[model samples]
Target: SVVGFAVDLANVWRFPYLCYKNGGGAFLIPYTLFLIIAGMPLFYMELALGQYNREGAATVWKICPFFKGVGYAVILIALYVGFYYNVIIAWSLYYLFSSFTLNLPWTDCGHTWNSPNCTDPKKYKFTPAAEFYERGVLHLHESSGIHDIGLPQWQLLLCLMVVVIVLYFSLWKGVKTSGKVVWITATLPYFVLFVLLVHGVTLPGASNGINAYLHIDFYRLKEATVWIDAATQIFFSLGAGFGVLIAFASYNKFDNNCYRDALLTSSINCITSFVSGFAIFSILGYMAHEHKVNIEDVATEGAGLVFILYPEAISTLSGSTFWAVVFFVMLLALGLDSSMGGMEAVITGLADDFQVLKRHRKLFTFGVTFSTFLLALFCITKGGIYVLTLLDTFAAGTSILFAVLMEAIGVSWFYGVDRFSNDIQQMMGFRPGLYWRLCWKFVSPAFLLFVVVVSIINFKPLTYDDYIFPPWANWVGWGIALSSMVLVPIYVIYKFLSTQGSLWERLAYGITPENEHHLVAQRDIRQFQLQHWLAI
Candidate 1:
């Protein structure tokens, strides 16, 4: 469900538009190939590591005494990301609610509409902020600058309260509850896609969207950024570096075949992404017809492309109310599943850290929920989306990739791949294919490092009118990225220097409370034998 949810939003909306704008159908080849070469191999490794350790991914890093910090670093960044990502999910939730009202702003030719053709600001009758406030959905903007869209404070607070309540209930009981919910959220995407594709294709200009999406050119394949975008999309969609899988695996009962399960989940996730691309492009084609513009031009960046542009396109269709509501609601459900699962990873990791939390799982769950609820307010405040977007793109994108690199290296090199491979063979009742060992030791790490270097060389700061992020945000982005990769190793090194011997005897070798007592018993037996020999 988490993979489905994570893949849903990234693929259905953002990626289709990205493909349309970048090179349409031409982008898929590189995207799919990278999904296999880079995405699948690493995901399988994470699953194997998680299951082998039978602990949260963060704790799993302690397999080697020197690399425990890497595990902590991954979970820490995931926690931070979990806090901010919900802000975006909340936005989708807000939009989903708005879709139900009469004369929803996007449908009406209002002046406040920010799209290319909306024209007059005053004439824009279907104002999102205006309608939301009138219905008491949000509060009026206290700040009067570009940052303020004039939403009512009460409504924003109320909406946030709703988010907190839902998250609390959704996760309080753990994976049983989460798994059941995923049943709904995970499957809803297909229904939504079918509706969108059917509706979009029937529209007069739908062909344009399809053409714009699929008109692949072999020539642009040489661009490094194109390949990077594909790799990034796969990573983002699959939740590969997010530590979500680690948390998910922690819930599995012993004997679960994580290696096979991971492969199944990752493959399904990639196929869904490609399928969603078609669903989105079909709708864009309809919008292009309605606007009398080329499909390429109407295509846009980020959430607005769907919530804004698609709504406008649907408005041109006859009987659009039903279609629009279905489309947005589908997107909303997909985002909910993805965001909630991603957030759970962080909550699970933190709860594991504070041993007392296990005794009061419900309270711990609520505490994490409330903390995220409070932190989300920062992302919703004036000028917050800009900051959120930057972090989402740069900090999130880089940290996850780099962190995965550390995980692969730590597990394959420090932990000994031969032993690790043998463990997998024993668990599964058969040896792993040679490819698994090769990828773990060399291929996966090399590919990830290459992406990191290339991303840095090609890094271009995003600019929004009058609101450029100062150099500090850029530095902060890289700082957050590197912190996850470096923090774990640094902490492990410190611990090794300070109390290596004691910590080693206690925590090393994947020992658990159940096994620790047996180990103590064995030590006692050896001591007794030694004493008797000395006495003799």
Candidate 2:
């Protein structure tokens, strides 16, 4: 289940695009490096924290009250993610319905929505599929600005409702329902990927796509942006900073060997990313072949890659409708699984804090589902794509890096890694070895700092293709980014003033566990038994 959440849309939709842009095969060097130094270690740490504490993301902050803000930051981020992420599911639903048509809508330029600029790939140089997405689905305006955000498209609005209904049912029962759903949703994508992979590789020009993806350019590694992108990809792909891992792990039994679970899941995620590249690039190669264009010209990232380019490729296939159905269904499953995890984190965190809410979990779930559904309606609007782009850029992109960096520093230095290892030893019946300790103490934090620094240095204003956002919109982007992070310092001041102690005493008190009654009771029972045994 943890693996399902970690290996979501990013692996399928984002990583391949990143690889294409960042030197193809050479990108793996930094990616693999960060996976070891940052990804797996943080994975292990979050699991250990949740399993040992037996708490959700927010309540788990009792471990180090000063860093409790990290928990809230994650919940806030999850709220934003849960609200916006489902927009992608709405898109998948839209595509899934479109797949049932005998002729896929985006294949040619004859549709009512298709503009004069739209061009058939067979006869013209431009991408008709891209035009279909902009004009037909999004109804994007000529103006690049989002100031006149328009009404929701009826198709997208209906699909968005379906998405919300599906999400509500999947999560209304909380983990019990979601956990069962994972059995199908989590595993189904692999079968679909294998089917697609087998089909894609047999197509003409498939090898060219593979070559474009795997062709190494060693020079690309020297660029700081490449490494920064790799690290960011690792964080996003692994579900590290978002608190979903912690939320899921909180459901496990205390003795569940999460150290092993962490490694297995993280390894599977990395492997899935690598293998899915073949499935994606093979079709992209075919698209390039059909159009008689270079692979780079057709390749894109985010929504464009999945909706436009991939659909364009599907249009050219033999059994186009069948493949389209399978592909969109695969995307729906992949996206829903990840969305469940994000919403679950928000639900669990709230339930943990308010016992009353836990008692009425179903009501709470509905409220969250409905509220987020309402919030997400904005994304289904004609201008929704622009809003989605802004949110994705700020909310999921850089903010998470800051959250995870704070998490590493708090866990390692403030809460103390030695103590954390000891807690893990109690749960798993063995301490984490030296390598794990070093990662927790130094390697993960160092790599995270490096990534954070590089991201800031290479930061550019938000743009979609050739359209640059105005200065005010860029400020809004920064505001969204800071909203997730400002919680940290604001929380610090609140805790300091609210805590009942002198200056040094308040500082000391923040680091100590708030609720240790369970541990104390267990210890006393052990002491009593030992003494009784000695007397006997």
Candidate 3:
């Protein structure tokens, strides 16, 4: 009923949150527009391109050598993201152990961790689990801010080590064993998701919560941010620029129908998001009713939702401890699958691109996972959540959007969308029609450019729960964002200078596929014509 790569932790948390905040059900209009405009086209484009070439992101750019750097840029971004994302999975791993307790450890009884102040009277309502987590688990008070933060808490360090260690073993050995893991990690969430949904909607306030989720306020559509956020949600949710799609699709059998695979995978992602919405709101709505407050009053948008409200909501159930284990167990699988996708993107890209690396793939896999673990040390620190937000706010956003924009131009303008369509035809024997052709050449690139522009323009200085990032912190973030962006032109200069060519010749080969370079060398290029330029 489902597959790996698309099902993830974001489907559980972030997607529904976006829908809740952005005009409720009316948000779907812009959401679907961007999917048609950017998400679906780009998703299919990468899947088809990867499968046809049977290559990883880095070397796959033989079709357009100019984009070889863009390939490196994306693979690096996927690894850079692992520096923090695995920390999230580590937290889930920790919670998994906590659930093993015969009685859940969260409820307050004036214990050492939970004083009376755990719930403040003036705030109206707050759950006991937040205090338990904030005080006992995170020990967030040990570090003052990002500036004062460095303690890699022993507990979290162990959990994070377990996560990356497992990721390394799963990837290093390749699919012989990992294939079995795929079935377990990819399918567990769907199983528990149904269980939670059934339980949640049967509760007192679940239907009203679903009503609010579906409630349309077209007035929210008036805001530009509603549109931008919709696209952002769609982009990140689809894993557009991370290059995992390319890496994953490279393994597909030739003559396989990538168009159907593309549609199936992306549709599954979007559908999982929709179903997770009911599971979330039904419980959130019940929380609001039991607390005797408006849903807005009880709602929060972070790890608090998963650890605090969710645990508290289910604690009232007969099998509270059982459900607790099930939730985190599902999270462990969901997070590991998603993180493994990012890990393998890096693993497969370099392993396939470099010959020596491919020869010692097992050693290279360990090296990659070790580097990630070392990079992740700061994120597992006592004040690591601050570091986590810094990376997420800067490292993942405009940088990836910028990479995707370059990708669109590389394939559409230089590699030629007509050529791209022909490759798909060779694989599946169906010429991509006028609609997909226009999207590849014009519409999708423009959409990417627009989103990249809006993302940077909307940047807020790093803050988490009112902790102001100092000026130096912002500079560090900007530097991180620019590092990957710079990789594109950095390689362009290298490729141009090393090749034996006049300036015109350099430009020609950079844009030309290696196989097609002989035609350009003869100066008998049909692609040189204007009609060929817009073949669609």
Instruction: Evaluate all candidate structures by whole-model CA lDDT and list the values in order.
Output: 0.64, 0.77, 0.77
For residues 442-533, write the lDDT of model 2, one tens digit per residue.
Answer: 78778778778887788778776666677888888888888988999998899889867566456656665666434542443222243422
**TM-score for each model:** 0.81, 0.90, 0.93
Error of 2 at 61 (Å): 2.2
TM-score, cand. 3 vs. native: 0.93
Candidate 3 lDDT by residue in tens digits, 1-536:
34534577777856766665554677778887888788878888888888888888899988778678888889888888888888888888888898887777777646676656566322232356777777677878678988888667898888988898788878777743446656766667787778777778788877778888888777887666777767767777888788888887888778767567668777787778778777777887887777778877675554345666567666767888888888887788778878878888888888787788877878888888899999999887878877877887677767887888898888888767777887778778789899888887889878878877776777656666556889899999999989899999989889888888787788787777788867776886655678767656
Which 10-residue window of candidate 3 scores lowest in summed lDDT? 117-126
lDDT of 1 by residue, 97-126 (tens): 766766765534343423334332231213
Which consecutive 10 residues in model 1 have the weakest lDDT in total? 132-141
**What does candidate 3 score in Cα RMSD to the true structure?**
2.5
- Preferred candidate (lDDT higher): 1 or 2: 2
| Model number with the top TM-score | 3
In candidate 1, position 118 carries an lDDT of 34
lDDT of 2: 0.77
The lDDT-based order of candidates, best leading, equals: 3, 2, 1
